[PDB]
Design an enzyme around this catalytic site. Structure first.
Site, mmCIF file in Angstrom:
data_model
loop_
_atom_site.group_PDB
_atom_site.id
_atom_site.type_symbol
_atom_site.label_atom_id
_atom_site.label_comp_id
_atom_site.label_asym_id
_atom_site.label_seq_id
_atom_site.Cartn_x
_atom_site.Cartn_y
_atom_site.Cartn_z
ATOM 1 C CE1 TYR A 140 1.141 -0.312 4.364
ATOM 2 C CE2 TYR A 140 0.212 1.934 4.285
ATOM 3 C CZ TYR A 140 0.997 0.958 4.901
ATOM 4 O OH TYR A 140 1.647 1.255 6.069
ATOM 5 C CE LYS B 152 3.584 3.092 2.592
ATOM 6 N NZ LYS B 152 3.782 3.633 3.926
ATOM 7 C CG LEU C 153 9.036 2.304 3.869
ATOM 8 C CD1 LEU C 153 8.949 1.204 2.809
ATOM 9 C CD2 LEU C 153 7.670 2.763 4.297
ATOM 10 C CD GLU D 39 10.951 1.518 9.388
ATOM 11 O OE1 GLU D 39 10.813 2.352 8.498
ATOM 12 O OE2 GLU D 39 10.807 0.319 9.173
ATOM 13 N NE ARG E 21 -5.853 -19.779 5.208
ATOM 14 C CZ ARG E 21 -4.891 -20.638 5.569
ATOM 15 N NH1 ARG E 21 -4.886 -21.918 5.185
ATOM 16 N NH2 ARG E 21 -3.867 -20.165 6.274
ATOM 17 N NE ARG F 72 7.013 4.013 -0.410
ATOM 18 C CZ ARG F 72 7.038 4.849 0.635
ATOM 19 N NH1 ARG F 72 8.153 5.183 1.276
ATOM 20 N NH2 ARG F 72 5.904 5.350 1.094
HETATM 21 C C1 LIG Z 1 7.223 1.605 8.714
HETATM 22 C C2 LIG Z 1 7.319 2.959 7.985
HETATM 23 N N1 LIG Z 1 8.530 3.609 7.916
HETATM 24 C C3 LIG Z 1 8.613 4.864 7.337
HETATM 25 C C4 LIG Z 1 7.493 5.474 6.823
HETATM 26 C C5 LIG Z 1 7.611 6.850 6.136
HETATM 27 O O1 LIG Z 1 7.279 6.784 4.722
HETATM 28 P P1 LIG Z 1 6.719 8.029 3.890
HETATM 29 O O2 LIG Z 1 7.663 9.135 4.151
HETATM 30 O O3 LIG Z 1 6.940 7.468 2.429
HETATM 31 O O4 LIG Z 1 5.276 8.215 4.137
HETATM 32 C C6 LIG Z 1 6.277 4.822 6.879
HETATM 33 C C7 LIG Z 1 5.054 5.426 6.209
HETATM 34 O O5 LIG Z 1 4.284 5.937 7.015
HETATM 35 C C8 LIG Z 1 6.182 3.571 7.452
HETATM 36 O O6 LIG Z 1 4.950 2.951 7.495
#
Ligand SMILES: Cc1ncc(COP(=O)(O)O)c(C=O)c1O
Ligand SMILES: Cc1ncc(COP(=O)(O)O)c(C=O)c1O
Lengths: 277, 277
Positions: A31, A145, A201, A177, A98, A50
């Site tokens: 997503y 993601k 991410l 993060e 499934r 992305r």
């Molecule tokens: C786990 C994670 N890390 C970092 C981010 C930051 O990504 P973005 O700057 O592309 O929204 C997100 C998005 O919210 C995220 O879900």
């Protein structure tokens, strides 16, 4: 309002999800979230790239070109008359009887997208927020993601119970993060952040901010820091499409320096404002 | 057929999932599979207990008692006239406007259950199967049977691509479990299997097989073994609700001993056969 459902924009009331949609049974999908300012989409092509790269990493073939996807998203903002807020959209592998291996019959992916009117977080960007450290128990392909978000749901709930806005995650005390943001620390005019490998991410706001820093001629070092070093920084903030550059002024009762938004964070917020529509 | 939708059994086509069901956006739920043999649910009380325990570990409160839940499963099997096959059922935290933290408000959990005809995998039990080693990249709370299954679908796809029935996962050179099964090795008449901690799901067939070993006086050591030790075992097999005790006779082109199903695997399958309806 109206929802994008595969390649149609329908009334909300019209969309129905199947119980054997693989996104409902295995979280097998990806997503994105895109912010809209005064009716215009910010960094929409970057987010679409992305989405298709997350989809290829787990071998989902999205059935539309990237330009058809951008037009469908433009249409959705118009119909819903979105002024400031965001668009949410996801892709699952499809609905199939499934089984863990990929559908032997080639099934089509299911795409869902919709909007929410939501103002900029001005009080938070101004005053800053509290955060808390949480151990990172997530899987080892955090570079995708995906909809497998249970590790992040439990970390954000822990934060919200302590009166914090965000949870900063760490693997054996190396900060990776936030539960839904990237984390930056500033020490002696240098910007620090974890390198983009499978542990995090690669946020688009993260990369916009590293560009803004190269523009104000601030040095950026993508080397990880610990929970201990995070607490010794002069300034700290988190980034995401919805929280922009949100200052972190306190972690677990400890003030970051004097508990006020630092000067380099204000410089990065001013430079980021020049990029908004 | 008919599906259980929360506490009602309705016709399959009446069930509607919402796009903001947390099961669809976060994989925020837990599930179970129960084998039914000749119209009789096998170890159904153990699977209901494990569902309520998985739901508690991520703080979903199931709104019904275990006894009302048991009755609902029973009605589902008879409304569908299931002979041999299985029941699948899952619970999610509910439908709420998308946000990672739990609904600050109070939302009801969504329950879904349905059946599938499916005979015993007799050829596999008699002949044995091929397997492949795949590294384990899943999250660190593998003791919860949750809907975050993307590491397992990717492992199972890889196994299927090599012509193998199952992927045997390993983390730090140590065999943990299969993508949807537990793994056991036999050497010099002793049964070995990885301890049930946060690295594996404590399988209900795993515990039935350990009980079979106790009944025929075969020593059980719940000790981890490495992938090289696995290759040096006299016998190997995997267990799950739908695959029972499937012999593994070969891994990545190397035969386990002579490549024939071993003596102790056969006497464990004979003992399992006396537990079955
Ligand atoms: C786990 C994670 N890390 C970092 C981010 C930051 O990504 P973005 O700057 O592309 O929204 C997100 C998005 O919210 C995220 O879900
Ligand atoms: C990851 C995993 N391990 C083990 C098992 C075997 O457990 P059980 O014997 O309860 O079916 C399963 C069953 O689905 C599983 O998904």
């Amino acid at each position: 309002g109206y929802t994008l459902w595969n390649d149609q924009i329908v009334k909300d009331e019209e969309v129905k999800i199947d119980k054997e949609d693989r996104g409902y049974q295995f979280g097998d999908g990806v997503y994105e979230v895109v912010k809209v300012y005064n009716g215009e989409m910010f960094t929409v092509n970057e987010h679409i790239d992305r989405l298709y790269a997350s989809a290829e990493k787990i071998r989902i073939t999205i059935p539309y070109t990237k330009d058809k996807f951008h037009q469908l998203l433009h249409e959705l903002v118009e119909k819903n008359e979105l002024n400031t807020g965001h668009i949410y959209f996801q892709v699952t592998r499809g609905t199939s009887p499934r089984a863990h291996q990929f559908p032997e019959n080639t099934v089509k992916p299911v795409i869902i997208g919709y909007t929410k009117e939501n103002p900029r977080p001005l009080e938070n960007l101004e005053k800053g927020v509290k955060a808390t450290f949480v151990e990172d128990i997530r899987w080892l392909r955090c570079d995708i993601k995906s909809l497998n978000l249970l590790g992040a749901v439990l970390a954000k709930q822990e934060a919200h119970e302590k009166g914090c806005y965000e949870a900063i995650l760490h693997r054996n005390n190396t900060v990776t993060e936030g539960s839904s943001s990237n984390v930056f620390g500033i020490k002696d005019g240098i910007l620090y952040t974890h390198p983009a490998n499978n542990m995090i991410l690669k946020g688009i706001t993260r990369d916009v901010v590293i560009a803004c820093a190269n523009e104000i001629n601030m040095p950026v070092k993508e080397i990880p820091f610990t929970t201990h070093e995070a607490l010794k920084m002069d300034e700290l903030f988190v980034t995401s499409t919805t929280s922009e550059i949100t200052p972190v002024i306190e972690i677990d009762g400890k003030l970051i320096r004097d508990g006020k938004v630092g000067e380099w964070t204000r410089k990065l917020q001013k430079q980021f404002e020049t990029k908004i529509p």
